[PDB]
Amino acid sequence: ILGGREAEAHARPYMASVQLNGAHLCGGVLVAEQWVLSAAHCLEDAADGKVQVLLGAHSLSQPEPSKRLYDVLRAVPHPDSQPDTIDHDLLLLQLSEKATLGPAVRPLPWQRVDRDVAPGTLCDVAGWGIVNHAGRRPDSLQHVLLPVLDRATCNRRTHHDGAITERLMCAESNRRDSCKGDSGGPLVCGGVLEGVVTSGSRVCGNRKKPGIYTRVASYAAWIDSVLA
Ligand SMILES: COC(=O)c1ccccc1CNC(=O)N1CCC[C@H]1C(=O)Nc1cccc(OC(F)(F)F)c1
């Protein structure tokens, strides 16, 4: 997260760290007792590597009573996802068992009505991604409040030049933004999951290159199918 602040410990009990070989790789969001939603590019070339999900965390390295590392039974990338595209960039991870729920571990309600979030809505994005241009990695969860950017402005030649489909949304990236390592994390608006940070490489904190988030409402039937 660039231009953000340290999050209040355990105030976002749905927040997951998706780890590969014991290191934070991507953000994720607990959407059901046994399922974490993240981004499909997260597990590219991860083939053989150990994927785990850390729930109930604030610090990645310090002991906390609510912290629990879960193994993953199945990793389900969206079938239409591809390495060279930003489309259908979703991944569902089935945990080894249902998560132990409590004040610090709880699934987030997610948007099932396919209607756009109004431009200007203030949404929250959290993650353990880089915090500066040198690549400094925070030990604790960071967050930033970002206003939603209308799709037509996001699609201008100066911005993302027509790449923003109806299944994607944008948020302003003016010195405050999601960055490397925040991919897969949640974009929460009015206490409901609206988007998942995309995992394509992009410059951070440059107002001319808005943040791109996959709209979960646009994938409600796929999310339901996988869990079933
Ligand atoms: C919104 O995303 C952007 O704007 C963005 C801007 C540049 C490169 C990339 C991105 C977004 N893509 C990712 O993050 N991806 C792609 C899938 C894997 C994941 C990644 O690379 N994980 C990672 C790797 C090393 C260290 C690390 O940990 C920490 F982050 F702590 F360093 C995390």
From Swiss-Prot:
<feature type="disulfide bond">
    <location>
        <begin position="123"/>
        <end position="189"/>
    </location>
</feature>
<keyword id="KW-0720">Serine protease</keyword>
<keyword id="KW-1015">Disulfide bond</keyword>
<dbReference type="InterPro" id="IPR033116">
    <property type="entry name" value="TRYPSIN_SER"/>
</dbReference>
<dbReference type="GO" id="GO:0009617">
    <property type="term" value="P:response to bacterium"/>
</dbReference>
<dbReference type="GO" id="GO:0005576">
    <property type="term" value="C:extracellular region"/>
</dbReference>
<keyword id="KW-0225">Disease variant</keyword>
<keyword id="KW-0179">Complement alternate pathway</keyword>
<dbReference type="GO" id="GO:0070062">
    <property type="term" value="C:extracellular exosome"/>
</dbReference>
<dbReference type="InterPro" id="IPR001254">
    <property type="entry name" value="Trypsin_dom"/>
</dbReference>
<feature type="active site" description="Charge relay system">
    <location>
        <position position="89"/>
    </location>
</feature>
<keyword id="KW-0645">Protease</keyword>
<feature type="active site" description="Charge relay system">
    <location>
        <position position="41"/>
    </location>
</feature>
<feature type="disulfide bond">
    <location>
        <begin position="179"/>
        <end position="204"/>
    </location>
</feature>
<feature type="disulfide bond">
    <location>
        <begin position="154"/>
        <end position="170"/>
    </location>
</feature>
<dbReference type="InterPro" id="IPR018114">
    <property type="entry name" value="TRYPSIN_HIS"/>
</dbReference>
<dbReference type="GO" id="GO:0031093">
    <property type="term" value="C:platelet alpha granule lumen"/>
</dbReference>
<protein>
    <recommendedName>
        <fullName>Complement factor D</fullName>
        <ecNumber>3.4.21.46</ecNumber>
    </recommendedName>
</protein>
<dbReference type="GO" id="GO:0004252">
    <property type="term" value="F:serine-type endopeptidase activity"/>
</dbReference>
<dbReference type="GO" id="GO:0006508">
    <property type="term" value="P:proteolysis"/>
</dbReference>
<keyword id="KW-0964">Secreted</keyword>
<dbReference type="InterPro" id="IPR009003">
    <property type="entry name" value="Peptidase_S1_PA"/>
</dbReference>
<dbReference type="GO" id="GO:0034774">
    <property type="term" value="C:secretory granule lumen"/>
</dbReference>
<dbReference type="GO" id="GO:0008236">
    <property type="term" value="F:serine-type peptidase activity"/>
</dbReference>
<keyword id="KW-0378">Hydrolase</keyword>
<keyword id="KW-0391">Immunity</keyword>
<dbReference type="GO" id="GO:0005615">
    <property type="term" value="C:extracellular space"/>
</dbReference>
<feature type="domain" description="Peptidase S1">
    <location>
        <begin position="1"/>
        <end position="228"/>
    </location>
</feature>
<comment type="function">
    <text>Serine protease that initiates the alternative pathway of the complement system, a cascade of proteins that leads to phagocytosis and breakdown of pathogens and signaling that strengthens the adaptive immune system. In contrast to other complement pathways (classical, lectin and GZMK) that are directly activated by pathogens or antigen-antibody complexes, the alternative complement pathway is initiated by the spontaneous hydrolysis of complement C3.</text>
</comment>
<keyword id="KW-0865">Zymogen</keyword>
<dbReference type="GO" id="GO:1904813">
    <property type="term" value="C:ficolin-1-rich granule lumen"/>
</dbReference>
<dbReference type="GO" id="GO:0006956">
    <property type="term" value="P:complement activation"/>
</dbReference>
<feature type="active site" description="Charge relay system">
    <location>
        <position position="183"/>
    </location>
</feature>
<feature type="region of interest" description="Self-inhibitor loop">
    <location>
        <begin position="198"/>
        <end position="202"/>
    </location>
</feature>
<comment type="similarity">
    <text>Belongs to the peptidase S1 family.</text>
</comment>
<dbReference type="GO" id="GO:0006957">
    <property type="term" value="P:complement activation, alternative pathway"/>
</dbReference>
<dbReference type="GO" id="GO:0051604">
    <property type="term" value="P:protein maturation"/>
</dbReference>
<dbReference type="Pfam" id="PF00089">
    <property type="entry name" value="Trypsin"/>
</dbReference>
<dbReference type="InterPro" id="IPR043504">
    <property type="entry name" value="Peptidase_S1_PA_chymotrypsin"/>
</dbReference>
<keyword id="KW-0399">Innate immunity</keyword>
<feature type="disulfide bond">
    <location>
        <begin position="26"/>
        <end position="42"/>
    </location>
</feature>
<dbReference type="InterPro" id="IPR001314">
    <property type="entry name" value="Peptidase_S1A"/>
</dbReference>
